[PDB]
Structures are given as structure tokens and as C-alpha cells.
Amino acid sequence: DFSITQFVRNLGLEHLMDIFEREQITLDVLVEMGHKELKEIGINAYGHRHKLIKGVERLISGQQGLNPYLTLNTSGSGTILIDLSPDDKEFQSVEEEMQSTVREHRDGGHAGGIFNRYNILKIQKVCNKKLWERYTHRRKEVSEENHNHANERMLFHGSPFVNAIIHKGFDERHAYIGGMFGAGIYFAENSSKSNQYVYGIGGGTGCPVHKDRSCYICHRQLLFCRVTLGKSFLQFSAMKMAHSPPGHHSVTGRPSVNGLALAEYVIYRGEQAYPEYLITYQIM
Amino acid sequence: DFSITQFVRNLGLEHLMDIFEREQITLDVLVEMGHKELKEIGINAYGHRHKLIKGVERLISGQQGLNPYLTLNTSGSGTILIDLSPDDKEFQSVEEEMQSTVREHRDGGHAGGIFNRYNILKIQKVCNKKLWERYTHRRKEVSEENHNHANERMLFHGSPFVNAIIHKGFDERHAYIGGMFGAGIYFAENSSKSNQYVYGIGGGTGCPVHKDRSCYICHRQLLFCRVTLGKSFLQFSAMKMAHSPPGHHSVTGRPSVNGLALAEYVIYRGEQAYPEYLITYQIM
Amino acid sequence: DFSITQFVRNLGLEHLMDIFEREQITLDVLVEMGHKELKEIGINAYGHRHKLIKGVERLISGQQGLNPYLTLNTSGSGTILIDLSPDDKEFQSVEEEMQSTVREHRDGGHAGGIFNRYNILKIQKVCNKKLWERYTHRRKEVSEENHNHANERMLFHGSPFVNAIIHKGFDERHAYIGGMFGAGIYFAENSSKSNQYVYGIGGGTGCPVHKDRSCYICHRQLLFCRVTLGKSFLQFSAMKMAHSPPGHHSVTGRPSVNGLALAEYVIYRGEQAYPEYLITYQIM
Amino acid sequence: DFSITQFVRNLGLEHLMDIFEREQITLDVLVEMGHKELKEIGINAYGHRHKLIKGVERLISGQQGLNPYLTLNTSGSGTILIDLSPDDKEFQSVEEEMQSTVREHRDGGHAGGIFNRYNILKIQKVCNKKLWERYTHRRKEVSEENHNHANERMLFHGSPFVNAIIHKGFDERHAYIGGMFGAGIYFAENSSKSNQYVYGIGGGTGCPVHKDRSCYICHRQLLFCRVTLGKSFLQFSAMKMAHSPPGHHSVTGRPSVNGLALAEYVIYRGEQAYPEYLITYQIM
Amino acid sequence: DFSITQFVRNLGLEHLMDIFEREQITLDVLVEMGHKELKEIGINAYGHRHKLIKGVERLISGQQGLNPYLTLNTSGSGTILIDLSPDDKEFQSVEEEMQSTVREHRDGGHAGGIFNRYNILKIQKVCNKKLWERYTHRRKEVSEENHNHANERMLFHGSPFVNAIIHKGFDERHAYIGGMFGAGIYFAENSSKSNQYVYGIGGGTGCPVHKDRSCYICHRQLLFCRVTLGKSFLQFSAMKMAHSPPGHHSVTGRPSVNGLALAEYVIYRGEQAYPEYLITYQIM
Amino acid sequence: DFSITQFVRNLGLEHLMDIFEREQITLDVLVEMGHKELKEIGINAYGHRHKLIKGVERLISGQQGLNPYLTLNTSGSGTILIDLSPDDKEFQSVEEEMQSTVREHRDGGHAGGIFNRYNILKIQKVCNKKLWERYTHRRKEVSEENHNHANERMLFHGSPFVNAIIHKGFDERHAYIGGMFGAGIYFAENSSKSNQYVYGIGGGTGCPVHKDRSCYICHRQLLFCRVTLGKSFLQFSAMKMAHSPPGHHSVTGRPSVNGLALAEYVIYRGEQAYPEYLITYQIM
């Protein structure tokens, strides 16, 4: 609470500090107050309010190159999870999407386990202002190309780094290099295909507690995400690449008799995906 | 009670949580509180209220694409039923509409049973904010056409799925495909004609308990519903159609010597009707 | 013409009419003018402005049931067509989508003719605020029923009634009754499949002038349209339906070995599609 | 052409078209005109101006989702080249940077040729508002992630695709996959190192006329580019990668006894570079 | 409060003084108030406002050579320190830069103590409008030379005069005369190299409390500063100079086998550096 | 040459090029022309002038970071010399200053020559906008640091590099390292003292032709200069320094019994001097 003290003292208005103390006014609060709000807390003289507002202008706009405003706007950022009520139709739509896309993989449940259904424990909306703005800026950019069409999908993602994704967003710097199309972030339209990646590549060693890849006790987590595909490149065979092909925004792997059994979607830029829903579940 | 905790924590205002605990302030409640409400519960410092209100703004307006307001506003919705007092004039009006509209149909009371009057047990006003707003939106849309006239009537509907209707509204995706005019929602001005369909088409198998189409014991339910007709297409013979004819908003089938014995009304959009009254009765 | 005169005379402000005559102030303009606008045109006396504003309020709100505002606000509505520059990236993306989706159809070019590419003459954007707001209202509804996802695609439509569509919107009361999936509105992802229907079902009799289905002279017109699919019902075999399946917002017919050659999409609500681009072209 | 005509006709103001014909007002000029400009061109009635302004607002903001403003505002975008005065200090400093960074390469000038200095013919500034805004947006992001420090450098780039870069910008979808640090975009702080690549990898086959990698006749083109490196990852030995290492924005390869003779810089996002100067020259 | 009294009395408007007394209006506030502001505080008559504003113009522009405006604008100038939150990425980037640039110095920690890591207590952003404007003016001047490139770096600085620097900026009149490149201001890209100078040349006599050059208790301060290097002159050997070499803006000392072990940067004009971050730490 | 063509072509206004070709409108002229000027040369349509002015705005301010305005505005810069009439009082006062400050030096005319007076051939006023602006900016800064008094003087400077000075300004990077007070720029108030330096330190070897330090035939040049001294440090005895003493702006060496015969003035910043008069003369 010292930056506000220095600011007010430099303005010559130290005798107002008691007011600022009782109202818990910090510098980041003060830089957002006008004549009306300053009058609300008892700064009655016009000269005082005018001096305060001019000081704020000199700090924020006069030294924009130092970005003091970004230094003052740290509070309130971060991710919050909002629980979806099981009786609401949004929860039910998400659960139906999870349940109705389960398939029987070529492996007998080795990577993901042996099951037919899920037991869903909760679903949470992920809210992060900065990540959402990054996503919408990129989505506008993609739709500006591609005749005003973002080509947005909602797709599943399984990863042992879900917490990192939800707090920091998707990142192609952490791409899946071993993927069929190479060095990309991978999403599936089938929930079981993404459940194959909950505990690592090929299932890893299973759950941390029992080291079982078909554990029916430990809570697993999946992501249901908004993915911007734009103009998507259709591919049937493996093709290692570092970025999207020229003139495209993503890659789509289609199932084939001698190739993929289920569809696959790859983006090479983290900002083209946003993790809307976090799903906690057990396999049954 | 965790989303509120995460929000307050990200704002750096954890020391206030005890207050939010005693007043049962959830996130859905907090997003609706201004300076006055926060001051009521004991948030006395202006700075704390300012931070909370700005955080709510960043969450609700800032991430409007994710629609957090809808996820928080699931509570309180849903249908409720209000009992009409038998001594009220509204109850007597509905009862008179029920009784005066009984007719002797061509069948010897096979479908609806053999009766001349009803014994009314209770009449319930159905209240559902979402369904009502959907219906009024459609009604304004229709009256905007058809020279500022909704052409609104109150008609009878009978169906074994009354509960689904009163909780989720009328749905043209559950239309009576086999009806004379084809794949729509059917209403009758005569309550007996609707009572013929309480247990299903042609009376079905009757009451579930006794499998009797003329049972005088089991309770029956009808719906007295607001229906928007707009510009109604007048018809006499059968005409299998999937939607309203061009330039109309419903079909009215009039009695004919070689056709209908009683009037019929068909709508082809589920939001062009609303179930205002649920009537519980027995045939006598 | 005389509305403004009557309104002004009823207020005893007839002497002002000369001003209203010079500034071409009609009643529909006047209902949108506050103190600042009225001061701009020279109503200098606060009392006259006060009387005018109160009278407008009593007309627009006091008699809202009559909807005088809708009567006054008819001017301006309607469709405009904004040409795309061939040098711009939007034009090139729309053209690339049109060209790359040509396919050889099972019939030897009987319906749409014999061609491998198009000569694109014009691409226009269709702007109509009322239709746009109808479509966006429906899109919000569907998305709220489908976990915040509209499932929006850009698809082709061909029809001999393109002009009526671009001015009146898509209407399910003019649905393709004889289609494979029932009475709805049909879209293709392949421009040639839609091109098969520009002159009518099966190509009709060809162009109006030469009565040739494979004419290389007459200008054709296709619609490139936003289509909200929401939760789509996947189908492989024909089945006729009047409306969407319960709990679904559209039908999609996927290619099958013994079934469809190319994908089809069907909506059953006119307001679930918006024609965003009108394309004028010839087959080569 | 006809867009302004349709727009004005829809508002019932066709009698103004003659004015709009003589002042060459198109819809894209009109949407930027207020009361003052409309007065300047002779629209003297306030009511007419009010109608035009409201129609524009209804098109632009009312139908934002269609992005008509983007459709209208295409004209004027694109690249322009501003020739630098050889007597000005900017030209001299760029030429000095070009000449003084020449070095003797390990090969006997096989890729680039045999020379000790250049004959500078032209130096041009590249101006493209869209590419510039893309670059500055990315720069703000990166510096926000690197304690308010973009870490901007001026580096040379040689490529056979200089024209595509100056008109479309740098694109990681056209990365040098064969480089020692993976699929990135490569820059050098020595003009001769980039001179080695103007005719292709290894100099290609030399100039298109004489097919001579050491031609002293044909004009060559090099780019001098602003590169945002952010937190750069230091590397002394080759290692192929698709994107930047975690927590980093670029890779810098440093000279080593058994490794690089000269420094290299690799970025993995096309928007992290802007081509500021286009240098035309010959080797002597 | 007397200058405003004299001003208003000379204008003949002494009867207004009461208002000015209650609103705490001083001459420094008044010189910035136009008609709207004077009306806000209750100067209702246009003539009084007109006289006030003309008097202010006669003072500010009419006697510019006396610079009364500067005499009135002293308040609000000065430095403020804004504390970075340890949970923010800015703080973490600065700390990572501090920790990762630690090296083992030729002296066994004689000057800077013995340690591998720091304990970072706090990091503050330094904000001074006037010093910032001096820096940005010099930066634009340098970049106007050096082909529109400031060549800006972020470098550490240690000094027993950090307070004087943050309140008055970098000053070449306090240059390090005995440095290897002579009478300049010295910065290091390695934190520990600058830590060696925190208590003076060669560490001085250690911390004042214990006179211990390797104290682990006392708090040390470093600066992380923006430095404009422009066209830097590369050097390897000691070279005493008073100013930059001709055509250059700074000197870069590069490591050599027989020379420096770590890089060094020297400016000869105090306005080419700005002290952005103040870091308080202990050696561990 | 082609910049204006590109700019106009990108706007779709190529048909106007003939006007621009006949009126010799280049891009640097065009960016300074508003509606009135464009009307003067015959751009009659308001729409065309509008497009031109908006394109200029997008270039100049939309891409301010590229500084295109500096690239365009190079022409017209440079020094001009304005001859003073030998009959004007300005010429006469400058000549009187030259003649009346001649002194007999301790050396026998070795460095400068043997003479009592000069023969003045020309006096020229040096006009260079950029150098003058740099001077006045520094002068403002100094006077703000010296109670509003810049302490400006008019003093003589002799140099073999007069041409470079009048075209580039004074430069501390070319300081007289061997001077009595260190690495600064030295000015005399006695013309003969500065005459001692027109052919180098200690007179060098004399004139280029006769290699004579007392040549009465060759044309020598002195500068009469406005020097900002600010707060000057008084010194009686030699002491070398690289910059001004702390809290000062210059050094003044007063004559002493064992020190200087004549006064000296030293600045350590090139921008604190401006060369006003170029004097051509011979000794007699």
C-alpha cells in the first residue's frame, strides 16, 4: 500500500491518505476512478479530484512505454472453474457428447482401459480472460481469411498436463512431436481416443496410485475444447510437418481402411484452441 | 461454493470469504450485486466493492462468448403449478368452457368413453419463464406479419405426454404425423375431442390401471392452451403437409358434412402454443 | 406526409412547421430526436422541445400496443448487395472453395451439364438486417441447446428462386418435399451438386433462353450460406421426415457405398440458414 | 457501383443520387461521412442526413457478424515501396551495415560468389499497414512475456521469394526445413551469409539468365528486417525442432570452433518479423 | 493560496473567491480549466468565465519567456515505485534473468561475495515522467540515425548510488573514470558482474553494517535498465576514451582469451539509459 | 518516382495520374495536401479527395512505427549560407568583433601568424533547420536547469574541419583531447586565439599551398558561434575531464598569473553550440 502513498505525496495531497486508508483504495483502484467515484468516497473539493485525475493521466498515458498499467492490472487474472449443475441441459449435452462417441479401439483397452461407459463426477466451465481474448483474436484472424468462416469445432483432448493447459493455455511449444502428422496439438472427435492419452503416450504406466491403465478407481480428466480449424488440409496417410501446409490453418486426418480408424484434428498454433470444459470421470 | 472462493482468491480478497460464508453468497448471487447490496452485507471499504464489481464485469462481459451468465443462471428456472381456488371466477370460467363444449362423437364413446359431463378435481396455472418468453417472441413475430394481429385463441389438447409438454413445452419434433393435415400439433375447441386422445391415438389401451378406455375411476388430464394462429389457412379435406402453407401460420379445419364433425386447429411450430391450464378431471 | 403536421398541430406548435419543412423532418425522423438534435435544427425554446419530446413519448410508448414505431420504421429495411473486389482475399477464398469442390457426378452431366471449372463473374455479399437478426436469434437458441456450440458451416444452395430467398430469407414453407430426407431445406458442400439445381429439380429444362441444361452462355447464381447445424443426426439411408428428430437440430447424410455419392445437409427451420454470398458464374 | 444506389433507394432518397454521382461517393466513402461531410457535399436537409447516417449505422454495427465493413474497406491496402535518397543518412547507414558485415566464407564463394563489397543500386522502405499491425501486435505480446522487452534486432534475409514476402509477409508455413535448427525462418547478421541464399539453397543454379552463382551483372535482392527475438535460446550445435523451446521465442546459434562460423537467428512464427528495407545490389 | 487571489483580484472578480476557496482551486488548477470545468464549479455567468480564461491565456502564452507554466507544474513530478507481484509473469521473468546470468568470477568472490543464487526480496518498477521523456527523446534521435533501429537492450547496473539514479537518472557527469573503456556508464548482461559493484569499486569495503563484502544478511539493490546502444563499436582491448568513437553511440567489450571474461557495455550519455527495474535481494 | 504511382494505384485512382504527372505531385508533396489543395489542382469529386486523404492518413499515422514521414521529408534539409551585406550593421558588428578582440600572443605568431588586423572577405549566416532545432532543444533543457537562464554567449572557434561542422554540427566525438580541460570543444572570446587553430593544433604546418603558418595570401575561415554555457565551472589551472563537472554545464578558464593568457570556454556536448557566422578572411 506504498505506491499509492508515494503517488499522493508527490501530488501534495497527503492529508487525504486517511480517506484512502479507510476505503482500501490502492493505486490500481485509483487509476480507474473519475470525478464521480472520487466524490463518492468524500473527495469533495474539485481541485483535489482534478489533481488526482491529472496525476493518473500522467502516469498511465504519459509513461505508456513503461506499461505501468499492465503492472497494475495483475489482480483478478487467472482461471476460475464454474461447476455445471447436473440437472441443467448444458451438463447433459456435454455428458451425451462424452458417452455417445465411445468406440472399441484396435487395442483391447491397453492404452485407455476396458470399458463401455463413463461415470461422470463433475463438469466445469473454464474461464480465463486473457486466454479467451488470445483465442478470439486468433479466431478473427482466421475467419478474416477463409471467407468469414472460422470453421470452429468442439473436440476432445486428453493429456497428463491438463492443469498446465487450463492455467496457461494450449502451446505448440509443448507439441506432440511423435504424432502422425508431427509436431502438433491433437484433438479427437471421439472421447475414448482422447482417453487413451490421459496418462501419457500409449497410456503411460496407468494411474499414479496403482500403475493400472484400466484403473476403475482413480479420477481421470479430459478437456472439451473450442478449436479453430479454418481452412483444413485433408490427409489420409502419415505426413510429418512442423506447421500447417501453405494456405491452410490446420490438418484433418480422415479414417481409412489401411490408415486411421477414427478422425483426428491437428493445429500447429496454441492460440487456435481454448479449453472450454474440464470433465472429471471414471471408466466403468 | 468453490467458484466464489476461486473468484475471491484471484481478486486477492480472501479475507472476506467468512462474510461470504455467513450470507451464503454464491457466484450466481455475487454477479447480481452492486455497491448498495455489497454495502448491506458488510463490505464497507469502497476499494473492495470496486474490485468485486470490476471482477464481475470482466467475467460476465469480458468472456461473453463463453456465456458464463447462462451457466450461473440455471437455478430458479423450471415449471411450477399454481392451484386455482374453486371459488374463483377464473376456475368457474375454465370449468364452464370444459363442460359446455362436450359433444357426442360418431363413435359410441369408444375413444374417450361414454359420458355427458366431467367431474373437475383441480385446475392448475402453469408458470415457466423460459417457455413463456419463447412463446411471446413467436407471437410478436407473427403479429408483425398479419397486420399487428396475433389471432390468439384458447384451445384444448390431450396427450399421454402432458408432463413433458408442461416441463419442456410443445415440440413440433413430436408432432402427430398421422393426423389428417399431417405432422403438426392438433388442438380442438371441444374438450371431449381432446379427451379422446388423453391415453393415445384412438384412446390407446385406456387407463393404465384397468386398461379401460371408458374408466370412471382413474384421473385424466387435459391442457387448455394459448395458441397463436396468425393468418390461418382454411381447409375442409385431408391434406398431408409438413409445414404451414406459404403465407400462413396455421391450419383451421372446419366442420363438413363429408369431412370434419368438429373444428380442428393445427400448428407447425412448437413455440406457437403455450400450455396455460392443466385440468384434472374424471368422466361421468 | 401529413403525420408530422397533425402531430405538431395537436400540440399547438403549428408555427414551427416551416422549420420542419426546410429540414425535411418527417414523423419517423422526429421520433428519434432528443434535445440536442432539436437544438441543432433551431428549436431554441426549451418549452417547445419539451412538448415535442413528451408527445413523441406518449405516441411511441403510451400506445405501444398499436406498435406505431414499427409503422414508422419501415424505411431502410431490405436487402443490399455489396460487390466483392476480385483482388481481395475474401473473393479469392470464396472462388477457391467454389472451384476446388467440383466433382464428377454419377449422371453424365445431365442435370448440371459437362464442366470441370467455373468462370466466376461476380461475388456479392447479401446484407439484410432483419433476416440477419432472425438468423442470429435462432443461432443463439440452438447453441444454448448444444453446449454453447452452434456447429456453423458454410454450404452451397441452388434454387430457381434465389431472388425470393435473398429478399425474404430461407423458408421451410417452400421446402423440397421430394428430397431424400423429407420436407426441408437442402445444402451441399460440393458446388457442382448445388449447381445441378439452379434451374430446378434434376436441372429442369435448362436455361430460360436456350432451354439447355449445359449452356455455357447464360449466367448462373449460387448461394454460399451460413447454416447452423447444431446437434446433427447422422444418416446413411433415405428416410422422410417433416421435422428434425427429437433432440436434434438438423440431418446430415454422409456418403455411403450403396447410398449417397456426396454429403448432404438438411435443416427444417428457415431461420437456421442465412445466404451470405451470391455468386454469378458460368460453367466452362 | 450499384451498392450506393440500392442503399439510397432503400432509404427513399433516390432524388439525392445525382449529387452522389457528381461527387463520386461510393458506399465505402459514405460509411465514413457524418453531418459535416454530408453538409459539405450539399445535403442541406437535416432529415436526409439523419436518414443516411442511421442507415449506415444499421449496416455497419447492426450486421457486424457479416463484417460488411471489412468488405467495403479493402481498397487502399497493399504494399508500397518508398525509395530512399542516396544522399540521406538512412540510406548511408543501411549501406554501411551491408558493406561492413561482409566476411570470407568457408567455401570459396561457391554459394554466393567471389567479392569483397557490393554495388548498391536501390534501397526501398516497405510499407504495408496490415503486415505492420500483425508484427506490432505480436511484438506487444512477446515483450509482455519478456519483462517489457521485445529484444528487437535488424537482420538480413536472403530468399528467392522476396516478392512474396514483401507482399504477404513472413510465413512459417514456408520455413527452411533443411536448416540446422529445424523448420524455422532464418536470419543472419552478415549480409554475405544471406547473399548465399538469394538464388536458392546453396545459391541454387545461380542467376536465371547466365545460371551463374557468381554473376557480376544481374541484380540481387536482400531484405533488412526487424526481428523480434524475445527470450532467445542459445545453441552452439545443430538440433532440429519444429517450434521454439519452452519459455522461449527464438533460437540463436552462436559461432563455435567445431560449429557455426557465423551467428544465426531462427524464429518459428512468421509474424515475428517485418521486412523493412528492400536492398537491390550487385556483387563486385 | 495567494497567487490565485491576486489573479482573481486583478480581474476584478474577488466576489468569486469563496467558490475558489471551497473547491480548493489554485492557479495551477485554474490554468487548465475551460468553460465546462468553470461551469461545473458554479461560475454560471459567461462573462466571468470569459474573463478568467482570457486572463489565463494572457499569463501562459503572453509571457511564455518567463515560463510561468513550468513554475506552476512542479507538483506531481518525481519518482514512484510500483511493486511487482511475485505471482506475476513479469516478476518471474526478471528473477529468472537475475538467477540465470550468474557466473563464477575470476576472483573467488572477493568483490561480490561467494554464492550461486540470490534470494529475491522484491522487484519494483520505477516511474518518472520527466526522466522517461528524456530517455525516449534520446532514443528517437539515435534511431533516426542507425536506420530506424534503437538497438535497445536490458542490462544490469550495480552502484552505491542507485537512489540518486532512480530519482535523477543516469548521469555521465558521474561516469566511472577508471573503467576499462574510460569515463562511461557501464552495464553488464551478467547479474553477478554488476553485483560486484553494489558496495563500490572492487566491492568497496562491504556492507556498511558488517563491512563484509560477502555478507549474507544485508539487502543489496541492482538496476535492470533499458539501454539504447545504437551503432555499437566492437572492442576487445582496453581503450580509454571520453566519448563514443566517431559515428557510434556506445562501446561493446566482447570476451577474449587474453581480455574480458564477460561482456560489457558502455554509454557516454546519461540520457541513453533508463532505470526500469529496482531489484532488492540477498546473496545466498 | 514510382511511389506516388503505387500509392494512387492501390486506391483505384490511376485515372488521376495524368493530373499528378502534370502538376509534379510526388508522394512527399501529396502527404501535405488536404481538400483545398487537391481542389486547387483539379480533383473535383469529393469522393476522390476523401480517398486520397484517408490513404495518406493510413500511411503516415497508421504506420508511424516505420517512420515513413521521415523517409519522405528528407528533401529540403541541408545547410544554406546567406551572405551579409558589407553595408549592413550586422556585418559591421561581426567585423568589429573580429577586429577588436585581436591580441598579441605569448608565442611570436608561430601558430597563427604575425598581424594586427584582418581583411574580411565574407560573412555568411549558416542556416540548417535540424542543427538549429537540436540547439534550441538543448538550450531549453539547460535553461530549465539554470533558473530559466541559458547563459548564451557568442564565441569564436577555429578548426581545420569547419566545413564538416557547418554541415553536421558540433560533435564531442571529435573533441580536442589534448586541450587544457580534457576532451571538450573549445571556444575563445578573442578572435586571434581561435585563429591559432585554423590549420590544426599549433597551426599545423600552415596553409595547404605554401605550407606557411603566416600566409597572407590564403583564405582562412573562423566560426562565430552561439554557445549555451548554463552553469559554468570556473577553473584557473589545467585539469583534464571527460564531461562537465557534476551539477554544471560547461567549463570556463579565466586568465591567471601562471595559467591562461586569455579566457577559454569548453563544452562537453556538441548540441550546446550552433555555428552562426562563417567568416572568410586573411591576415595582414
Ligand SMILES: Oc1nc(-c2ccc(C(F)(F)F)cc2)nc2c1CSCC2
Ligand atoms: O487427446 C489426445 N492427446 C494426445 C496427446 C496429448 C499429450 C501428449 C504428450 F504426452 F503430452 F506429449 C501426447 C499425445 N494425442 C492425441 C489425442 C487425441 S487425437 C490422437 C492423438
Ligand SMILES: Oc1nc(-c2ccc(C(F)(F)F)cc2)nc2c1CSCC2
Ligand atoms: O388433442 C388432440 N390430441 C391429439 C393427439 C395427441 C397425441 C398424439 C400422440 F399419440 F402423442 F402422437 C396424437 C394425437 N390429436 C388431436 C387432438 C384434438 S384435435 C384432433 C386430433
Ligand SMILES: Oc1nc(-c2ccc(C(F)(F)F)cc2)nc2c1CSCC2
Ligand atoms: O442446392 C440444392 N438445392 C436443392 C433444391 C432446391 C430447390 C428445389 C425446388 F425447386 F425449390 F423445389 C429443389 C431442390 N436440392 C438439393 C441441393 C443440394 S443438396 C441435394 C439437394
Ligand SMILES: Oc1nc(-c2ccc(C(F)(F)F)cc2)nc2c1CSCC2
Ligand atoms: O538469409 C537466409 N536465408 C535462408 C533461406 C531463405 C530461403 C530458403 C528457401 F529457399 F526458401 F527455402 C532457405 C533458406 N537461410 C539462411 C539465411 C541466413 S542465416 C543461414 C540460413
Ligand SMILES: Oc1nc(-c2ccc(C(F)(F)F)cc2)nc2c1CSCC2
Ligand atoms: O554495473 C556496473 N557498475 C559499475 C560501476 C558503478 C558505479 C561506480 C562508481 F563507484 F560509482 F563510480 C563504478 C562502477 N561498473 C561496472 C558495472 C558492470 S560492467 C563492469 C563495470
Ligand SMILES: Oc1nc(-c2ccc(C(F)(F)F)cc2)nc2c1CSCC2
Ligand atoms: O578555437 C579553438 N579551436 C581549438 C581546436 C579546434 C580543433 C582542433 C582539432 F583539430 F580538432 F584537433 C583542436 C583545437 N582549440 C581551441 C580554440 C580556442 S580556445 C583554445 C583552444
Ligand SMILES: [Zn+2]
Ligand atoms: Zn488407480
Ligand SMILES: [Zn+2]
Ligand atoms: Zn381406470
Ligand SMILES: [Zn+2]
Ligand atoms: Zn442458355
Ligand SMILES: [Zn+2]
Ligand atoms: Zn547473371
Ligand SMILES: [Zn+2]
Ligand atoms: Zn551485512
Ligand SMILES: [Zn+2]
Ligand atoms: Zn598560403
